Amino acid sequence: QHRLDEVRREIELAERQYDLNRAAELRYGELPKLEAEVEALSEKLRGARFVRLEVTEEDIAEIVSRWTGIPVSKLLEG
């Protein structure tokens, strides 16, 4: 994730004005490998023993319920 953000900081560092010919240009099609790893990887990480990673509605609804009342409704109830 850190290797991808800095790169997104560099792709704009070239299209901004200079050296668009060198690297920054269109590694835009080779980087999905990262977006391919972080996924097939997180999937792997999905488990127990505190592999905590995903932040979901329940999580949100909970901290929200903590300031109000009952996720059973806040959430569920559509």
Q: Is 17 in the site for its own copies (CB under 8 A)?
A: yes
Residue ranges in 19-38 that form contacts with its own copies under rule CB under 8 A:
26, 28-29
Min dist. Cβ of residue 26 to Pt ion (A): 27
Min dist. Cβ of residue 63 to Pt ion (A): 11
- Closest alpha carbon to 34 in 62, 69, 53, 6: 6
Min dist. Cβ of residue 28 to its own copies (A): 7
Residue 60: C-alpha distances to residues 8, 45, 57, 72 (Å): 29, 21, 5, 12
Contact residues toward its own copies (CB under 8 A) are 9, 12-13, 16-17, 26, 28-29
